[PDB]
């Protein structure tokens, strides 16, 4: 039953690691999607629950699952400022240059929200500095528009 999928989604929002493990063991769908196309992995990536992220990956969660806006878990983790989660998603084979419905990569989202350390990690993992969104804007363009000089400077120099 997909009751268990809805329960797994709630557990992952609530940060209830023991409930996640016991729902997975009961044959919950690891890739259960809510109304907005968030998996448990997306939810844990947003809320910064690292132990939940790792246990979901170990149980076979789709690292490149898209929500209704085309955001992967890496988009979410990068946007939301969760460095350790970003590293873990990359190790597990997350697509560093995956594009959302605006054509924003994870680097775009990290640059836009001022997450310098996440910018540096994404560059090391082979993020495209020249990637343009649907309005023609690079990550550097975003960082500069948002007032994140430090990140704008790194991205100009990585180009």
């Amino acid at each position: 039953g997909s009751d268990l999928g809805k329960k797994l989604l709630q557990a992952a929002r609530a940060g209830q690691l023991d409930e996640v493990r016991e729902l997975l063991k009961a044959g919950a769908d690891v890739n259960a999607k809510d109304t907005w196309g968030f998996t448990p992995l997306h939810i844990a990536a947003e809320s910064g629950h690292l132990e939940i992220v790792e246990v979901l990956l170990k149980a076979g969660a789709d690292v490149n699952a898209k929500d209704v806006q085309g955001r992967t878990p890496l988009h979410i983790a990068a946007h939301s400022g969760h460095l350790e989660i970003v590293e873990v998603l990359l190790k597990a084979g997350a697509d560093v240059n995956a594009k959302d419905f605006r054509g924003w990569t994870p680097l775009h989202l990290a640059a836009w929200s001022g997450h310098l350390e996440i910018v540096e990690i994404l560059l090391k993992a082979g993020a495209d500095v020249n990637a343009q969104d649907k309005s023609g804007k690079t990550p550097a363009d975003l960082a500069a528009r948002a007032g994140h000089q430090d990140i704008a400077e790194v991205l100009q120099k990585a180009a």
Binding site: W36, Q69, R102, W112, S113, G114, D133, S135, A146
Partner: protein, 168 residues
Amino acid sequence: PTACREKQYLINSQCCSLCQPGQKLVSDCTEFTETECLPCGESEFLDTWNRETHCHQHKYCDPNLGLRVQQKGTSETDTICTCEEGWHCTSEACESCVLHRSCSPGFGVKQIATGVSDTICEPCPVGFFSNVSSAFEKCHPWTSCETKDLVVQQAGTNKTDVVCGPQD
């Protein structure tokens, strides 16, 4: 099920990200851009996901209530205050402080004050005295007249030493 997720809001047919902890809203998302958020200033904080247009100011630790800064705030947490040396917390919450009191004459320090407790004073028992108002001084023993080959001419009190004098 709402048109957007918990950490989003709806405007102009678009599901926009709320601003993250440590950031405030400048501009709504559009088709072409995610929500514009600006980091809180250095003496400011915001602990939750939000659409607010101002941050909270870090708490002032008022010297005139006996407070100092224990720990400067961050973009997500408030400043933490503690008592200045020589002052102790009014209550467990430590929202203001009070100067350590002195044990009056007749009373001596049993336990010295700390940042969480006032001076504990005891009445000077027999054989002991204290002639000062002080937050450090213990009860001192009465002088032994018999060590000096004198007698007690005036009795000691909680507040005064013995006055010794010659035999009759």
